[PDB]
Design an enzyme around this catalytic site. Sequence first.
Site: not given
Ligand code: HEM
Ligand SMILES: Clc1ccccc1C(c1ccccc1)(c1ccccc1)n1ccnc1
Length: 394
Positions: A234, A231, A236, A343, A352
């Site tokens: 790509e 997650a 970040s 997130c 970052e």
């Molecule tokens: C620019 C950085 C990031 C953005 C804009 C971003 C955006 C998001 C968004 C919009 C979601 C919610 C998707 C939904 O509700 O359908 C999410 C969930 C998540 N993101 Fe990110 N994310 C970022 C960075 C990261 C990073 C650095 C990690 C891990 C190190 C990560 C791991 C996750 C995970 C595991 C979820 C799922 C959480 C859950 O379902 O409880 N993300 N992110």
């Molecule tokens: Cl960026 C994003 C938006 C909506 C759904 C999922 C993701 C993404 C993710 C994270 C956890 C599990 C599946 C997909 C994702 C993961 C891999 C490729 C694209 C999007 N994500 C990355 C960081 N925060 C959220």
Amino acid sequence: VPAYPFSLPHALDLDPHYAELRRDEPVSRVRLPYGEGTAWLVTRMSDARIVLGDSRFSTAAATDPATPRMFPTPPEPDGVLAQDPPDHTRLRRLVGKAFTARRVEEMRPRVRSLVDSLLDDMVAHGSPADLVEFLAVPFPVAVICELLGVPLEDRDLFRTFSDAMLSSTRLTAAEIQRVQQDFMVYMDGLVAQRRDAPTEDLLGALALATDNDDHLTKGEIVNMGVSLLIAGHETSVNQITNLVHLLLTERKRYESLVADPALVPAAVEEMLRYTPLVSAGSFVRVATEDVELSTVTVRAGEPCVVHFASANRDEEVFDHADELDFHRERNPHIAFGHGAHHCIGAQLGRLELQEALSALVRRFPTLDLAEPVAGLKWKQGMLIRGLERQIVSW
Ligand code: HEM
Ligand SMILES: Clc1ccccc1C(c1ccccc1)(c1ccccc1)n1ccnc1
């Protein structure tokens, strides 16, 4: 009626129909590529917050193969985002007790050490330089490594698993698997070592997490560390390029940070609000009951997609909605989602982007884009927008 992705992305530009929908049909029927039937497309912030933050929607229901989706493959139900409240809640809690705000802010001196190294190599290579290869790609993987406490000697092999995933890598058939399974070995071996002997890092603390007698299994700690590495990388990477892109290309914004580097955090928030990083919006929500939205009311089996980027441009909530204002006072954006599935890596993401930008500002007050904009190699960003290359001068 309308096929949902209305278009393939150009640059960081929004399809003009989201704004039209936002005023005229905030909640709108659309047909996604695969799965069956139609879906509610939710364009504005009020509705977005309901849909994303109400107990009456399910993401586990959307693992059903007859739910509208973007990829032909449906979603595995043991993935965090697909998990529903009782178990998801247990999960967020446990990793919550390890992926804490404190641990993330305590990265900062180390993480700043890494950016300054990476930028050192960029100065060594001289005066034009591909910011993607020198900063964007290596930086996120290196940060995750550090957070996991991946032992110093075999991070280069973490580098190859990580960027052997990215939008394209070796393309060597599907024995990207022979990359998965021997790495999957590694994690399992590593997870096992720290469960016996914990250390100051995520894994060590995922090992020790508790919740009134509840455990994370060796298996659960593997699925998260990996789920987190995938997650974080790509996304970040691409976001780094997106911010740099916005800062140069209008280049008074960059100047405004050189003049006032204390503005970097507010700028990053504002840039997170504006960048349509996530191109088709959030994981599918399937209403379990009857939830009243802005203009329609959603019934119990119908799915919805929340589009974060349109919510983030909602002119009911942000003055000068389609302009970058680094001095905006109120910024309730949902670039990181909302509610239960907010997130997990939100703060590490802010870390970052803060340290990257602030480093580039201290060290390269003369930074400039060193290729024509029209020609920029935008990824085909159906899921995540970002640049394949970014040459910059100083
Ligand atoms: C620019 C950085 C990031 C953005 C804009 C971003 C955006 C998001 C968004 C919009 C979601 C919610 C998707 C939904 O509700 O359908 C999410 C969930 C998540 N993101 Fe990110 N994310 C970022 C960075 C990261 C990073 C650095 C990690 C891990 C190190 C990560 C791991 C996750 C995970 C595991 C979820 C799922 C959480 C859950 O379902 O409880 N993300 N992110
Ligand atoms: Cl960026 C994003 C938006 C909506 C759904 C999922 C993701 C993404 C993710 C994270 C956890 C599990 C599946 C997909 C994702 C993961 C891999 C490729 C694209 C999007 N994500 C990355 C960081 N925060 C959220």
